[PDB]
Design a protein around this nucleic acid. Sequence first.
DNA 1: GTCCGTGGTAGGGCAGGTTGGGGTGAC
Lengths: 250, 27
Amino acid sequence: IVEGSDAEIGMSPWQVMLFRKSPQELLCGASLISDRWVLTAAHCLLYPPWDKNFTENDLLVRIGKHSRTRYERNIEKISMLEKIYIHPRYNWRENLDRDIALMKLKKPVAFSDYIHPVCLPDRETAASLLQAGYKGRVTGWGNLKEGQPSVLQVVNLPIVERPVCKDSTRIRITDNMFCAGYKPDEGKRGDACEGDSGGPFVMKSPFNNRWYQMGIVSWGEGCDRDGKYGFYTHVFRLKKWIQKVIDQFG
Amino acid sequence: ADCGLRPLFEKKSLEDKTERELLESYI
DNA sequence: GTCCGTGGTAGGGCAGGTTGGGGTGAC
Ligand SMILES: *C[C@@](*)(O)[C@H](CCCNC(N)=[NH2+])NC(=O)[C@@H]1CCCN1C(=O)[C@H](N)Cc1ccccc1
Ligand SMILES: *[C@@H]1O[C@H](CO)[C@@H](O)[C@H](O)[C@H]1NC(C)=O
Ligand code: NA
């Protein structure tokens, strides 16, 4: 996160840390969607241009965490992965279209003050909340500019109108992605950056007091550049896919 | 079922520092 | 009014799958 801030304790309790075991490595963020399922970006698991294709036994997941260094005893939980599921239509060459993946934990995780799943949108959440100018919140332990924070960073960013997202880059934008960030003159700044992929873009519905993951940090071009916008995987678009794999293989 | 309601916040009628900004952007 | 499935990220093929819906629809 660039131009973000230290999160408050328990502010993002569906936040999940995705790890490479050996050599140890903070790979990406992710999100807790039930006691046995984690959402993340596919490019965190699978990216053939860097000969990156992780197996469940390569990775480890950390939940409930606040500070990136310290083990937090009786606070954080570790999990192993049973299976990874990448979207069959995920495109690693052209534009990270459908950059989404699901991870099934080996054991379920007990919830706590610090470990709590976020909701997914349905048609009405998408209808009501996906509007230019409306802000969501992004969270991660990735780059502060294009070192690395000690504490989870948080920033609020407005959804940007689609033509503006299209125009601002040469990568072929897609219906399964949206972009968010401040326009050059709007004063305010901020963006996700590398190491933040998989983290969630949440929005608090003003109708129930509930948080919804509308996006997944996916890509950008540098971080926090003027006229550049962070890109996020469109969660609701891919809702039916999420429900099927959970239902069928849960 | 209980999704999106944070123990340290919604559950105990507390706001975090900047959630109001989000609300205001919906206006 | 028109347009979003036949390879592509990729097989076996013209459905349907964990996958081509229907919407922040775009145009
Ligand atoms: C894996 C994620 O941490 C990372 C997120 C970067 C988010 N940036 C901003 N400014 N919000 N994603 C990536 O790094 C992806 C995967 C590999 C390359 N990549 C990019 O975003 C490139 N910078 C641009 C790109 C290359 C190919 C296809 C799409 C985008
Ligand atoms: C990634 O690895 C898995 C397990 O080894 C393999 O079966 C799969 O085909 C690989 N996928 C790639 C390289 O796209
Ligand atoms: Na920008």
